[PDB]
Write a protein that holds these residues in place. Sequence first.
Motif, PDB file in Angstrom:
ATOM      1  N   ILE A  70      -6.175   4.435   2.434  1.00  0.00           N
ATOM      2  CA  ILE A  70      -5.194   4.492   1.366  1.00  0.00           C
ATOM      3  C   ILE A  70      -5.011   3.058   0.868  1.00  0.00           C
TER       4      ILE A  70
ATOM      5  N   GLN B 157      -9.806  -6.847   1.904  1.00  0.00           N
ATOM      6  CA  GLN B 157      -8.375  -7.175   2.007  1.00  0.00           C
ATOM      7  C   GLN B 157      -8.023  -7.886   3.311  1.00  0.00           C
ATOM      8  N   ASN B 158      -7.161  -8.894   3.278  1.00  0.00           N
ATOM      9  CA  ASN B 158      -6.687  -9.474   4.547  1.00  0.00           C
ATOM     10  C   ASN B 158      -5.856  -8.547   5.464  1.00  0.00           C
ATOM     11  N   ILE B 159      -5.840  -8.866   6.755  1.00  0.00           N
ATOM     12  CA  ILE B 159      -4.974  -8.243   7.740  1.00  0.00           C
ATOM     13  C   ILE B 159      -3.549  -8.727   7.472  1.00  0.00           C
ATOM     14  N   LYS B 160      -3.390 -10.049   7.349  1.00  0.00           N
ATOM     15  CA  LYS B 160      -2.039 -10.591   7.262  1.00  0.00           C
ATOM     16  C   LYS B 160      -1.293 -10.181   6.006  1.00  0.00           C
ATOM     17  N   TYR B 161      -0.004  -9.899   6.153  1.00  0.00           N
ATOM     18  CA  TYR B 161       0.869  -9.360   5.116  1.00  0.00           C
ATOM     19  C   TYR B 161       0.655  -7.913   4.674  1.00  0.00           C
ATOM     20  N   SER B 162      -0.363  -7.276   5.210  1.00  0.00           N
ATOM     21  CA  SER B 162      -0.660  -5.918   4.810  1.00  0.00           C
ATOM     22  C   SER B 162       0.529  -5.053   5.139  1.00  0.00           C
ATOM     23  N   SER B 163       0.964  -4.267   4.153  1.00  0.00           N
ATOM     24  CA  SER B 163       2.165  -3.424   4.317  1.00  0.00           C
ATOM     25  C   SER B 163       1.968  -2.097   3.593  1.00  0.00           C
ATOM     26  N   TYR B 164       2.656  -1.084   4.107  1.00  0.00           N
ATOM     27  CA  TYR B 164       2.401   0.262   3.628  1.00  0.00           C
ATOM     28  C   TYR B 164       3.650   1.110   3.800  1.00  0.00           C
ATOM     29  N   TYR B 165       3.967   1.917   2.790  1.00  0.00           N
ATOM     30  CA  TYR B 165       5.030   2.911   2.879  1.00  0.00           C
ATOM     31  C   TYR B 165       4.509   4.310   2.507  1.00  0.00           C
TER      32      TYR B 165
ATOM     33  N   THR C 165       0.363  -0.494   8.743  1.00  0.00           N
ATOM     34  CA  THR C 165      -0.812  -1.349   8.815  1.00  0.00           C
ATOM     35  C   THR C 165      -0.861  -1.987  10.180  1.00  0.00           C
TER      36      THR C 165
ATOM     37  N   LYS D 183       0.833  -1.182   0.000  1.00  0.00           N
ATOM     38  CA  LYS D 183       0.000   0.000   0.000  1.00  0.00           C
ATOM     39  C   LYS D 183       0.881   1.251   0.000  1.00  0.00           C
TER      40      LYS D 183
ATOM     41  N   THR E  98      -6.851   0.564   0.730  1.00  0.00           N
ATOM     42  CA  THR E  98      -7.433  -0.374   1.705  1.00  0.00           C
ATOM     43  C   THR E  98      -8.688  -1.135   1.241  1.00  0.00           C
TER      44      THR E  98
ATOM     45  N   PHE F 278      -1.069  -5.155  10.850  1.00  0.00           N
ATOM     46  CA  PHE F 278      -0.103  -6.274  10.800  1.00  0.00           C
ATOM     47  C   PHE F 278       1.299  -5.771  11.114  1.00  0.00           C
ATOM     48  N   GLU F 279       1.663  -4.680  10.450  1.00  0.00           N
ATOM     49  CA  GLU F 279       2.971  -4.076  10.687  1.00  0.00           C
ATOM     50  C   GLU F 279       3.152  -3.548  12.120  1.00  0.00           C
TER      51      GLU F 279
END
Lengths: 398, 397
Positions: A129, A180-188, B205, A102, A131, B207-208
């Motif tokens: 964003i 969208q799943n919770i697991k692996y969710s990543s964002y910069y 997130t 994300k 999501t 998770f993060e």
Amino acid sequence: MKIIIAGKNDIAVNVTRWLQKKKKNIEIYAICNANDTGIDTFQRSFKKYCKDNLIPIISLAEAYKIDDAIFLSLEFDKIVQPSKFNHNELFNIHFSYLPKYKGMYTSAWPILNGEDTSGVTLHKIDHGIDTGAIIAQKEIIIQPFETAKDLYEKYISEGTSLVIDNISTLLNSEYVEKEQNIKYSSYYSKKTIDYSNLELNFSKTAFEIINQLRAFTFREYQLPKLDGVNIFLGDVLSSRSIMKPGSILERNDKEIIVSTIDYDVVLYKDNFKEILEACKYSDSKYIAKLIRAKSILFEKNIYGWSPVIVAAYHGNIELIKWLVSKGANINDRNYKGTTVAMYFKDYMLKSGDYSGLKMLIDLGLDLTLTDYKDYTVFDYLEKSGNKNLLQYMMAFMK
Amino acid sequence: MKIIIAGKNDIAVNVTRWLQKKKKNIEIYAICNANDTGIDTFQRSFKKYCKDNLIPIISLAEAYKIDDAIFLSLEFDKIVQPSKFNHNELFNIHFSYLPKYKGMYTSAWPILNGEDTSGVTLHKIDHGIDTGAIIAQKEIIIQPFETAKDLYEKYISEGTSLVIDNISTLLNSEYVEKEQNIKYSSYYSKKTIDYSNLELNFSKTAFEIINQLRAFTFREYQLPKLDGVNIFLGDVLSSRSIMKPGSILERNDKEIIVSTIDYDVVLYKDNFKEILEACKYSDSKYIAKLIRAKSILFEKNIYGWSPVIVAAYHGNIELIKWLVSKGANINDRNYKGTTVAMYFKDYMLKSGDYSGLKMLIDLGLDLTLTDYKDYTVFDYLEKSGNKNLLQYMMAFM
Ligand SMILES: Cc1cn([C@H]2C[C@H](O)[C@@H](COP(=O)(O)OP(=O)(O)O)O2)c(=O)[nH]c1=O
Ligand SMILES: Cc1cn([C@H]2C[C@H](O)[C@@H](COP(=O)(O)OP(=O)(O)O)O2)c(=O)[nH]c1=O
Ligand SMILES: Cc1cn([C@H]2C[C@H](O)[C@@H](COP(=O)(O)OP(=O)(O)O)O2)c(=O)[nH]c1=O
Ligand SMILES: Cc1cn([C@H]2C[C@H](O)[C@@H](COP(=O)(O)OP(=O)(O)O)O2)c(=O)[nH]c1=O
Ligand code: NA
Ligand code: NA
Ligand code: NA
Ligand code: NA
Ligand code: NA
């Protein structure tokens, strides 16, 4: 029915072009991004395109008030507020395989992190964003040579295709979505890379460092630098210096070798300008010597001139053939859509040497193509009154 | 034969202990790390163990000259010159699945990065950091709830077993080496995390964010903090607040709920102190109400006292039983190796009530264990001349 296309670059342009072609019954409105200059660059100006095609450009606030439209975001730069529409047919293409990556700089972060793959995702716009619920996706393989620019161009292309494969179901409301799943969710966020102060970190493995080079290699924005010298990729040596990481082991005209945490790396000095100058008159053999990373052959200057375009303009047919053998596009274009064939025509006209056309045609040279003014090579020949050369070129088309 | 064991912590100690037991004839030499305080803490002091068992401690410079030794680094702190030894039997246990996570803080970075697994790796000491050829390695699961401390303990346990499983091949030169791949390698230095300045980043997130919590959870070092309140784990909720990430949505005596990039997260306030105190006399019904995250029940205070150890010393048999049903270790130890049984023994002496012993024995209580002075509960009872209880405990043996 109606569609609002909100965003930028070849993805907005090309999604729009398809719609004008295959869905001529569809009223199209455009929203452009705040920094679309109206001039074509390494990506097309969406604003220019819409003006040149009488596509009305509106504001997001105006788009909110249009009923019975769907809304499609394509590298759009504004926060879209779903409650402000009188419907929920709100769609985005994000340049990742959600739920990972994300946010921002998705051409760099997956490379920096040593990913083998990324993707593009069609999804619902909700309040956050990137999501919203996933409708379609497409995995993209990141090749080991590929730069942030290569990966951005793949995003643009795959994103265009994914829209085209799904846009009917978007228009019909015949699509399926999944949260969208919770697991692996990543964002910069944009704070995660400071492009005004990039610096290579050699307290890292050679794999990591080469991945830094790749991730920051996007010529129209920047190249990675060591000691103010611009670099165009690198490779890993078997050598392992016991000099502390970052120590410069050797320096020559073509390259810098550096100590890392593990294997030494060699960083190639960017010599693209010099390569491009040599493409006028040198052969295969000379260019092959100047080259370190092969993909440098597909780079472009600020006009969109690549090696194979320069070769064409100067009638360097032996080089054109070798370049195409290496991966170059026989129908490459500058940023105005001007093709290799058009530049070659300029050479034929100047020199009176027509003889090389057959060979280019047998490599795939396409005389039917149009530039961004909708002109073919034959349009230009008719205008300039060169009827005999026009007939000559037509005679070789197949 | 001979071996030089260079390093620290339970891995150094437990490999050494195994060698003294199972390879009688191997002469052992030790090199200790500079920061080894000589006092047993959350890890045993290797220097303390060496002194107490007369394993000579040598210098690195001395080690380079012992041509007939093998050299085994177990969290050793000094870089070695490989070419300077007159043999190449140089080995290291690294706490990752190499070539990933070379370097430092390997109980944190994998967690932070969202990894499902890590590993331990036995490999040669060579040029590079953590770059030598791999002899054997094993993957380790990182459970979704596990902390950096949990992961560290796993590296210690799995690293020890990996050395034990391979140590005969190392002393007899019958091992196989495979050079490490370039591809996928990663490395983090000491500079990558400033443990004197940790901050949770909510522009991430759920998770993060939960992974940050986990990664920064290592009580003997620190807990993560929000608004100077210490936090012991958290969970992800189903709601999605519209507020800007990091916004505190809810605050109470138990927990703080915060907005993130995607799902709201609940951060559980650390009430370990409260729980440990109530373990003296409260029953399992009361203690159950205090628990926000189950694994808090296996935490320890600065002396290594856990809820099960405190319950045992106060004779709280009903609690011990429930704690064990929740996965507590019936033979848990403090940092001096003093066992649950020894603590329960204290309670039996003070109270004169032996009625709990059988049931705890049935739950697995082990009376044969030795503390780090090498005494059993029986040794202690003899010395104290507590002949009645001694007699009773011996009846079980
Ligand atoms: C802003 C910026 C982006 N990039 C890279 C990272 C991005 O993923 C990629 C494209 O960013 P950008 O052109 O902002 O495209 P979009 O607005 O469609 O994301 O370019 C640079 O290499 N240098 C830069 O200064
Ligand atoms: C490719 C190339 C073009 N040119 C000339 C040809 C064109 O007349 C001129 C303008 O550049 P260009 O941006 O390619 O505009 P257009 O799309 O209209 O060609 O530059 C060179 O002088 N050298 C070159 O190598
Ligand atoms: C130094 C330090 C480490 N850690 C964590 C991360 C490390 O992977 C883990 C173990 O570090 P350490 O106790 O230094 O053990 P080793 O030297 O065998 O790595 O402890 C903290 O949480 N806080 C700290 O201040
Ligand atoms: C477990 C426990 C022990 N104690 C007492 C009995 C312990 O032997 C004494 C010292 O504990 P400690 O310093 O942990 O050393 P030891 O290995 O001798 O246990 O403290 C308490 O006061 N409260 C407790 O909850
Ligand atoms: Na509305
Ligand atoms: Na930035
Ligand atoms: Na090096
Ligand atoms: Na640090
Ligand atoms: Na939120």
